[PDB]
Amino acid sequence: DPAEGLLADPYAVYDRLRDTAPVHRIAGTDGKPAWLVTRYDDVREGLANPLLSLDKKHALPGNYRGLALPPALDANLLNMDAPDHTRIRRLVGRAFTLRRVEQLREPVRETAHRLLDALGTHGSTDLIASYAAPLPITVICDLLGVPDEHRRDFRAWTDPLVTPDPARPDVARESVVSLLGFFTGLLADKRKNPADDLLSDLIAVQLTEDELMSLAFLILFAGYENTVHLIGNAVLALLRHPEQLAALREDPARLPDAVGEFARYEGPALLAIRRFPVRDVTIGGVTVPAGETVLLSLSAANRDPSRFPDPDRLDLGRDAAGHLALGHGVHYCLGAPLARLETEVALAALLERFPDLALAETEPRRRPSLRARGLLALPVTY
């Protein structure tokens, strides 16, 4: 198999695959067959190809499992095509305009500074547990309007569902149940007494109840793991590239423009959401049968030397315009401006506060995954 070693060395396998097998039939972790696509042109076109459906009603009967969810949560943007997708995305997109997100800038900054306050002046931390993880989940709580007194429960429910322990799935199942009950109650509360928050705004245009519920769940889960690991991956990348770290420490005004190249170089999503051809589709010379499972590799596309010369180099001078880390076409990340704001703010606050930031260890601690590029821990000194 040209894809041997994919779990251990994704980027090395992608280099082999683009040259030898750029649309390659693999076995996924559950052993169901899927098509892995590694070339930039094929991934970009695929993301925008309306014949590649996100709706699993288009999946070959018997061919696709995925995850186990109450059917209210099937009404979600990343299991949906036009016109349904077009309708819901328009309503919620109001929330994430460059200006509505920009107003969160001071509160995001306040949250990040309160997390670093807990580190003191010198010592050691796991930056994932102390900084990269809590920041995005606080921001999501503030955006949705999760009352402060519920946040300890909310965090305890959310953690287990971010990479569910595949040997002990009971905690992850009781987490989904708990959040459904929680969100049902919170929506009722806001319906009876509107507050200044996203869920109160979504209730107003109420959007079926299932659709509201699906937006609460998808904004939570799309908004959490990816943001944690864009931040974490960017810190590791900086601490591994001293000349780049120096460039940013010196001229912090460059951070916003550098976010693009962090995402191209070490974005958190190796793979897009699975897609299903609505009929037989040719992708880079390979006819993929209708209803089969297509995995477009965003990371493989972003490291394609035919689009990004010297792809394995972190270059804050690079034109990273056209990277696919936040997707492309009608499902382009709803959170993109808030993803950008959180990364800018987190990195600027950390660099300003900890001028002696260094890695504690010779080696990163990578989470083994076909779909996620992320760290189990990021031990640093300061």
Residue numbering of the annotated binding site for heme b: 85, 89, 273, 275, 331, 333
Residue 108 binding ligand HEM, by CB under 6 A: no
| Largest Cα span, the chain | 59
Whole-number Å distance between alpha carbons of 129 and 141:
17
Residue 326 binding ligand HEM, by CB under 6 A: yes
Please report how close the Cβ of residue 88 comes to ligand HEM at its closest, in angstroms.
8
**Beta strand segments in the chain, E:** 23-27, 33-37, 52-53, 124-126, 276-277, 281-283, 286-288, 294-296, 358-359, 365-366, 375-377, 379-381
Binding residue (CB under 6 A) for ligand HEM from 6, 104, 135, 272: 272
Question: Nearer Cβ to ligand HEM, position 53 or 119?
Answer: 53
Please report how close the Cβ of residue 224 comes to ligand HEM at its closest, in angstroms.
8
Whole-number Å distance between alpha carbons of 306 and 322:
13
Whole-number Å distance between alpha carbons of 364 and 378:
7
Binding residue (CB under 6 A) for ligand HEM from 245, 338, 349, 378: 338
Binding residue (CB under 6 A) for ligand HEM from 22, 46, 267, 291: 267
Question: Nearer Cβ to ligand HEM, position 119 or 234?
Answer: 234
Question: Nearer Cβ to ligand HEM, position 82 or 246?
Answer: 82
Cβ(341)–Cβ(100) below 8 Å: no
Sites for ligand HEM among residues 185-204 (CB under 6 A): none
Who contacts 371 (Cβ-Cβ below 8 Å, separation ≥6)? 269, 270, 271
Whole-number Å distance between alpha carbons of 97 and 102:
8
Q: What is the DSSP letter of 321?
A: T
State both tokens at 143.
């955006």
Residue 299 binding ligand HEM, by CB under 6 A: no
- Number of residues in contact with ligand HEM, rule: CB under 6 A? 27
Question: Nearer Cβ to ligand HEM, position 47 or 314?
Answer: 47
The stretch near ligand HEM (CB under 6 A) out of 5-13, 144-152, 244-252, 262-270 is 262-270
Please state, in angstroms and as integers, the Cα–Cα distance from residue 49 to each residue in 3, 33, 34, 44, 89, following that order: 25, 21, 18, 9, 18
Cβ(301)–Cβ(47) below 8 Å: no
Question: Nearer Cβ to ligand HEM, position 311 or 327?
Answer: 327
Question: Nearer Cβ to ligand HEM, position 134 or 327?
Answer: 327
Residue 226 binding ligand HEM, by CB under 6 A: yes
Interface residues with ligand HEM (CB under 6 A) are 47, 77-78, 89, 218-219, 222-223, 226-227, 230, 263, 267-269, 272-273, 298, 325-327, 331, 333-335, 338-339
